[model samples]
Target: DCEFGYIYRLAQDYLQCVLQIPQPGSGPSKTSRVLQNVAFSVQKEVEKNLKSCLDNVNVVSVDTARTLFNQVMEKEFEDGIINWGRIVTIFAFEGILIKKLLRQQIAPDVDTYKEISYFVAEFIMNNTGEWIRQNGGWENGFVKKFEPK
Candidate 1:
């Protein structure tokens, strides 16, 4: 149950960061703030997922992995343009880099970076694409006509 708890907490924390972003309909009245929190949240989820995978195989305390996730998140967040799609891209890229680093530092048997990366990438693509379509694409006019699904 702890593992499930960890995964859920990680998702929750990450979503909290993401929710700060104004949804598509918020309009020009609300400044388009970069979603710094969402970026951080994605990193947290990646870290937790990595930890879970490693724990299953008896690996402990992946400090290098954590540092890698943090570094990747910070660099991508510098521009402050946050969207579900962009966060997904950041998460995928970070996951790949972290996986490569892990493979170099630990036995090949201990890492699941590639698998996790794929899952995250797919999820983002699906959900974000749906969000855009449902919200009337990226054109600013859609903001006035957007309806939640």
Candidate 2:
């Protein structure tokens, strides 16, 4: 049950941060404490399944567990605060997913953003072809009705 125990510990940490509970001192009212404990219990029941799928090398001791726990909690917090403009800028500036398309559609005035629209349009058309292939090709009944004859 050590595997499950780890999941329970992780969940407890996440809830504590989400609910703004500080460790080793004043934090949360009694009701919040009860709820957090309940969450911990549920986590224990299913964590074994997740553990079986992980590599042995990544399994961490209790002291190191806080690092993974904090990383997840930080991601949640950051996702909650993410701005769309910032996301677009990050992708475009880093030349990642949908970068050129985003720059052309949203900020075409920049010299670096020019002609990105053509690549974007071509990418969409190419992916649509691949999608058709994956779904049993254009003649496949489920999606065939949506296509022009």
Measured by lDDT, the strongest candidate is 1
Give lDDT per model, in order. Answer: 0.41, 0.33
**Residues 85-137, model 2: lDDT tens digits:** 22222212112212223323343333322222233223223323344345453
**What range of 10 consecutive residues in model 1 has the weakest lDDT sum?**
28-37
Question: 1-149, model 1: which lDDT tens digit per residue?
Answer: 11233223233323333433333443322111222333455556666766665444322224454555456556655675545455444544443444344446555543443334343344344434455445444333233332222
Q: Stretches of candidate 2 above 4 Å error? A: 1-33, 53-63, 81-149
Candidate 1, residue 56: lDDT: 43
| Clash-forming residue pairs, model 2 | none
Q: Which 10-residue window in model 2 sums to the lowest lDDT?
A: 88-97
- Per-candidate TM equals 0.31, 0.24
lDDT of 2: 0.33
